[PDB]
Symmetry: D2
Subunit: 382 residues, 4 copies
């Protein structure tokens, strides 16, 4: 009897780490049935219609759900969780999954975990034990408590889950699946990918990738920091790919910052919503430096030794190699402009903290090991 697996994807931020697993599951039809659910940001033009990435990977999408309430603020974030919760249960009764794969720390993943847990559907939670110093910590660890099975990416994440009283029998230390793609990365014509996304006259290691997200707890500070960050980038004046923000609450106010600085119509800048993951890896792997507060900066790019400037409070407490320079109180242009001079064009050693490149096969085994006779979470309090 095949294991019926449902994977729900809501944003490129999970799709980069779930697609490898989906590919793994699909390559073994003898042990697994796969149903894919697309919801959230994927269906939204502002976010780059990233459901197309799923279509271009040739996955049959069973179900599409509009689950985002418009407003781009905290109220809307909450209403979005509620919208997924009214819409999902009937889809889950139809699909009748044995287990559901949930990734990460976003509001959307809490909806998925909640709906599965309350309907007695097993949950495999990916990227569980980590620390990022925002509201996301809260969400991540609340999902951990709902989830029946856990897949973490580091030893320190494993120990955190065990410290949080999770059953060690239900934890698998696999590595991040993104590393399956990073450490298997086809450097094709990487120059023609640099030329596509940054411009014709750009040379390897001579450009910046800028990706900064609002922190929902302090939008007014997120605005001010982003202004100063752009001012620095303008002064530093080397070719810069600016990704639009990808946390919803505060997002339009951050986009307005870019608009009023003329970033959208500037020779030095390229404003984009989403770069396909395989192309994005090549971009960050050959970047002069990366700046902002993406998880990519602190978790992924270490693999290529790309210099990183991590700004603000998001990612405080994450494990990072020598390549990452933190500037918490990025409260002036000078501080940020300095960090750019220090880091731009350096080369660090290649780290492997968040993965060994064989996460997926370990995960597939862990899924086959699951015997279908209980379920109820056990909480090791002593």
């Amino acid at each position: 009897r095949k294991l019926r697996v449902c994977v729900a994807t809501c944003n490129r931020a999970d799709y980069s780490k779930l697609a490898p697993i989906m590919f793994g599951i699909k390559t073994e039809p003898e042990f697994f049935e796969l149903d894919v659910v697309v919801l959230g940001s994927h269906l939204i033009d502002d976010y780059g219609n990233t459901y197309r990435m799923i279509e271009q990977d040739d996955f049959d999408i069973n179900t599409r759900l509009h689950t985002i309430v418009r407003g781009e603020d905290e109220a809307a974030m909450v209403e979005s969780v509620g919208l997924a919760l009214v819409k999902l249960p009937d889809v889950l009764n139809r699909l009748k999954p044995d287990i559901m794969i949930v990734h990460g720390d976003r509001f959307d993943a809490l909806a998925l975990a909640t709906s599965a847990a309350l309907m007695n559907i097993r949950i495999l939670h990916i990227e569980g034990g980590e620390v990022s110093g925002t509201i996301d910590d809260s969400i991540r660890h609340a999902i951990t408590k709902l989830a029946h099975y856990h897949v973490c990416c580091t030893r320190s994440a494993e120990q955190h889950l065990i410290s949080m009283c999770e059953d060690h029998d239900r934890i698998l230390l696999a590595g991040c699946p993104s590393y399956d793609k990073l450490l298997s990365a086809k450097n094709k014509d990487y120059m023609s990918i640099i030329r596509m996304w940054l411009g014709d006259d750009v040379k390897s290691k001579d450009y910046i990738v800028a990706l900064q997200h609002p922190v929902t707890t302090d939008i007014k500070h997120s605005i001010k920091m982003f202004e100063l960050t752009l001012d620095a980038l303008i002064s530093f004046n080397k070719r810069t790919l600016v990704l639009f923000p990808n946390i919803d609450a505060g997002s339009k106010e951050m986009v307005r910052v870019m608009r009023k600085k003329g970033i959208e119509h500037h020779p030095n800048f390229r404003a984009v919503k989403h770069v396909p993951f395989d192309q994005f890896i090549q971009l960050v792997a050959h970047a002069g430096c990366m700046i902002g507060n993406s998880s990519c900066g602190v978790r992924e790019v270490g693999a290529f030794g790309t210099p990183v400037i991590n700004l603000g409070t998001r990612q405080i407490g994450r494990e990072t190699g020598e390549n990452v320079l933190h500037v918490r109180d990025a409260d002036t242009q000078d501080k940020i402009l300095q960090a750019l001079h220090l880091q731009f064009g350096k080369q660090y050693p290649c780290s492997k903290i968040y993965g060994d490149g064989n996460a997926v096969p370990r995960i597939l085994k862990f899924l086959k090991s699951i015997d279908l006779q209980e379920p109820l979470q056990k909480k090791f309090c002593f």
Copy 2:
């Protein structure tokens, strides 16, 4: 003095018994607190006894009422109910502009409230945090703990569980359960005329049973079978029995059907009721011959009167209980349950105080005033 704006949301009598004392406390100190009350969930539902009325009869001004329950009385409907609260609450919370929100317990409804507050940067005081009940409710309770910024637990073991789950000890208050404020202040009026109202004219103290059994959502077909056998035992044991309708939504109509097909609703020996007012209910359980089923009251509250208890099934496995509680986990035959009734009916145990000292509310009011309004962000104490 800038007053602390406190919003208390109540969804079910199961939280209202433990929140009402706090609401009374807050309301008695207008100089330090502003109070807004939000009523949602089960309270607005006839099947559950229109228990919003209990709030009206306590004289609280209800600011807002929200229909948040999706009909269906199954797991899908439970989930859609959480979602319905989440689409409805944020605009109410932006209007009310609370500094802190009080959330109680382990039910699906409390997870909606915690979620909405946490994602909108509203502070959360979570009541009854560190306990263990061995159902899906453990999961929910502990997920709420993680969202919540401030914690009020009822026992030392609950406090240690929160600390073991990596919560900041600075944000934990060990107060006791607020229900004990009412239990240990329970001035037994004419308790006989309360027995007569609810059980019948000819019933004597310690000669009746209070039966309160809830479905476990994880295994409804087993909940059904157990309840059938439980009623069969109660019919054979044949002493006057107050049967409270179930009060977990998923599986509820199938449990009600069990009662209907056994003729419990029209039987001389039984009284089928949705809700007994808390003050009257305390008197009922305090003088009962025994209590049977899987209520939290059985394992947490009635110990205070030494009332014998039969706890059936998997719900409440792992809760702290005094000598008054007899567990029958595999209640898989009528004989086992009928035996437990013979053993326990009419006994008297010593009065325990595990879940409270009777001064929870004043400790809570102080803890609320102590909160300085400059951060917020939860701290997670990860000792390796």
Copy 3:
């Protein structure tokens, strides 16, 4: 190319008139594909889990939706319409229907019509031109305006649609599909159906079928009328099948009326949620009389000449034969008890106002006639 037809059913009240069409469509696989959606009351124990009727007719249910908000009042009725509207669009994008069949005048049908119309899906509205003197008139006629194609049951209903400025080219006068079953009704052992539902010692034409619904506009009056109606039935003291109410708003207060009169535990009464349509036809066809305010009383039972007492304001303005006695101001027990003496055990001639028994084949032709090149409603104002 086959016509993709979606039929959504929400309540037994539409299912009695849609099932015949569904059967017709399913019997012609060469011209039609059928997808069935079940939602609303069908999934609710209080209403008799009537999705089972759909399962027992062997229809493959594609999708099930929980769309009812609990509360059994007007607010809940509205929230229920809204719940269907958030849940349906993604189902309709998946099913990709060419046309959707909507029946009747209930809040649920307005949700269906609204969602179809705003998504450019064609609508065939069944039972369009009629008059019943409650809020339902409003709803029925608002659905008419959304709907692209109309199937009415009488000539007077056809003229009403034309008077309301509908295009006569898009109206089909077919008859009510319920008449396909009424005028083809297998009287099997009808006595053993009487014995099942009323009791062992009951003789044909010596029992009452009581079916009274709350009027949402005046619940307090609905309560009082129902009390007096039951009091009359108790005094008249002939075996009575009492169907629980089947309009949601006010329903629990009406059920409470029955409970406090001891109707549920009385030798003379049988309280039931739903009698299967085929069995119900036999019951009403052989009844001594029928009482209350069902549409069955004024539209269907005329076919058997069964005496009818229509109480209150619901059904004022419906077309009725000689068999129906109206008592609008049923404001005392005596008036109702009198109406019972007058009507119980009489036999009227068999009328055919609402159908000829060939509605379905006419409808199937009308569906095949639809050429798939526009759509936009035309409003004949002159």
Copy 4:
């Protein structure tokens, strides 16, 4: 005197231009009316210009704000938006306890409002009822008419349409459009400094174009193509052009993308804007060289100033228009549109008053006071 409790819900600038005058009227007579304002829909959305601010700047106390729009900018999202209003409104309406609710127009949002009021037995005054625009909006408008208990129409032909649709003539008031209260009272201030603010420093009266084109939801790919050609014409015709973003949700982002890829947002000849305040907008269109697209303003309002209009496509087919409007239904090439621009740009027509006399509001206030509060149930005049 028991005051009439009036709730006005506003969802979009498209209703707010015609409801604000009534809200002002009601607010100026506190002795006869209590007013509660509900803001929902587009008003709370940055893409639409945060137009709740227009309500704040008119000094109305907003009782309630509701996020009711589902994101997606397509037909599915439009429907889910209606549903979202329907789950959120009933608890607000039970709280506000209105005697009557004012609903305007033909948009998906107004159907939610009408539905919720009608099913809760709240009386409805529907504004702008009897008109014809040849899209799905006809369907919506006429479905709202059927729900609504009281009707306020703007023309004699609209009145006859309502009567032909079997509405009770006793419940129809022919008032005029309230927008005309503002148009015919439009004290032209420094209109040049308003032209300079919105179009640029060097622009002269009657030498600019106002372009406002909305997608038709029934045929988005055709809406796209038409808009491309329209912009190409405007680029060739090369006179200063205010381009308003689209204001029908379904298809909106694909229309915005058209503008983006033509470089309209960064062109000397164009100014891309979301919303111009109504009072300033009147001055813009009153002095425009011509107006182009498919706004209702083009066919209903600007006639008052004799401003030339080009109405493109199927939206507005069947509306009553003066000599100032040139229809180009099959705008299928750039040449056809460029021609229409040459023909119309800079002309001056006579001032028409088809949609109003400028005293709509006072007639409406009287009609509200006339309502006696003893029924309600709609009557449907079915003459055979």
